[PDB]
Each structure stands twice: as structure tokens, then as C-alpha cells.
């Protein structure tokens, strides 16, 4: 059972821009079975980098591709949620991470951050709505405004407001 | 939550900067420590591997992994050491001749066999001749950094081998 383990976008469904890219569809009951065979990776003639499930037509769509690949688009649909294979999310940051998307939501000291969408323990200004593009969505630490400092997050913690998260360079020799 | 982790069988890792923190804790099971690592409670850090001591029945968490500095890996047959994914880079640099991570599919989405099997294919790629290539279970690996980026034998007899589809770091913004 392994559902739990993608990184989940609601009400969101990706297009090809190019033709050419793969997609496997299949009519199945509950969102659990594309994330069973997308993690298996059974009867799939490609690597499951993603996978949509849409609750209308009931069927999943696997896709050898995600949210940030060169010639998809995402589209916005009531019927769709999507998942998107952590192993695809790029893990490490590069410059300050002002492109960072992927799930660490500790901080340093290793306290649990606080949701974008939350006001509570700590108060600000970072809603998701106007830093549309920097995905502060759920808890993930994020560097929306690019600083020095790297991606961070408000924390849950009321006593310490906001702390840097640990989340290595890609490449620093 | 085990399954979160990839294991390197007889080994530890020791600090050689006795800065960074440490935790530890007799538990009953490796994957005791395995839950308390993924839901990071209680520790004053961010968990990014553990090692189970075997022999003691004793958690080891650490905010560091193998690739990290101020640190240094270990054989010792009472240990293994579990390193969390979000840590272990997943992304490639060119021919990826350091990739470490756990991918162990085709890019035509075929199960990889194991290096240390022979069946259906075999082959000279032993992980003794390689050492430090991590040529573990069935993960793509690319041990002689050749042109072509990560690859395995394949779990289909008709397949004897194909390239992973891992992306370039600098693949994405």
C-alpha cells in the first residue's frame, strides 16, 4: 500500500504538449490501485514517473513524466488528483532553491513545519495564492522569495517562528 | 517505513566533525528506528539515516548520510545503515558515474535483476571487482562511468539489458 509515498496534487491533471510522450490508461475502482501498479511499475512500457486519477471516469492515467517535464502542461479539472513519484521530484537544490519542489517539511533543528495555509502557531503573509509558481502547498520547507538562506518554512513550534531546512546542494565541489 | 530507506548491509558511519549530533536508543527492531526516523519525533535534528547495531539492539539516528562531510563510512558485521531516499541525490550528473540512488527500472519499465543474480543473465559485474560502486540488489548503477548513464540487466530473459531513465540535475529549472 503505497499511495501515502507520492507527492499529491488535487483537482490536477497533466497534458502533452508534444505528441510523442507515452500514457497508459486503465479503468480501475479506487486511486490506490494506480498507485500500487505505478510503484511496481507492472504492464507499464515505461518508468512511472507520475500517475492521475480521475474520480469521474474512474481510470487511472501513468505517465512516464511529471509536473516539470519539457512539453506537459498541467491542467485544472474537479474529477483529477495527481501524484508525482518522489524519486522524479529532484531531492537537491540548486543556488538559493528558489525552483526547490520536492516533501522535506522538517526544519534543521528538526521541528515540524507549519502549512503555508496555516496561520497557526505563527502569523504572515506567505499565502499560496499570491506565490502562485513556488508551490507552497502542504508544509514543505520553500524559498519563495529567493533569499540567501536557502528553503525554509514557518515552523510549529510557537516559540520559534520560522527556521532554515537542512536540504543538501546538488552539486558543490 | 523501512521500506523508505536503503540499506547498506554491514555498515556504519562515524563522525569525523564531533559537532554534529547524534541520538541513540536500544529499541527492539531496525524497523523501530525506521519510525521514529520518518516521523523525526523527538530528535533535535533532521533525520536523514539511521544505523540498527545488530548486536545491541540499538538505534543510531543521524542528521547526515554517506555523502556527507565531516563523516566516514565503516564495515563492522553488527551493523546496518539505513540512508532516508529524500537524502540520497536523485538526480544525475552527465554519465551519472556517481549515482547512488534506488531506481531499479528499465526506462521500458522492466524490472532490474539483481546484480548478484545470474538468471536470466549472466554476466562479469560482480560487486567484489567493483568495489565502491554499490552494486547492491538491483539498482541502476553505472560502476564503470561509462557514456550512457545508469543501466542494469533486466528481469526479462528476452531483455539482457537497458539504460535507467534517470534525469539531469540540470534537466529541471
Not at 502569523?123 to 536557502?150: I, T, V, W
Request: hydrophobic content about 25%.
Amino acid at each position: 500500500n503505497t499511495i501515502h509515498e507520492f507527492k499529491k496534487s488535487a483537482k490536477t491533471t497533466l497534458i502533452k504538449i508534444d505528441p510523442a510522450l507515452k500514457i497508459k490508461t486503465k479503468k480501475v475502482n479506487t486511486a490506490d490501485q494506480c498507485a500500487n501498479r505505478c510503484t511496481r511499475n507492472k504492464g507499464l512500457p515505461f518508468t512511472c514517473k507520475a500517475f492521475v486519477f480521475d474520480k469521474a471516469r474512474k481510470q487511472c492515467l501513468w505517465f512516464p513524466f511529471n509536473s516539470m517535464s519539457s512539453g506537459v502542461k498541467k491542467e485544472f479539472g474537479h474529477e483529477f488528483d495527481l501524484y508525482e513519484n518522489k524519486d522524479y521530484i529532484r531531492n537537491c537544490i540548486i543556488g538559493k532553491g528558489r525552483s526547490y519542489k520536492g516533501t522535506v517539511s522538517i526544519t534543521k533543528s528538526g521541528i515540524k513545519c507549519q502549512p503555508w495555509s496555516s496561520m497557526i502557531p505563527h502569523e504572515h503573509s506567505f499565502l499560496p495564492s499570491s506565490y502562485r509558481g513556488k508551490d507552497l502547498q502542504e508544509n514543505y520547507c520553500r524559498n519563495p522569495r529567493g533569499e540567501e538562506g536557502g528553503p525554509w518554512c514557518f515552523t510549529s513550534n510557537p516559540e520559534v517562528r520560522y527556521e532554515v531546512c537542512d536540504i543538501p546542494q546538488c552539486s558543490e565541489v
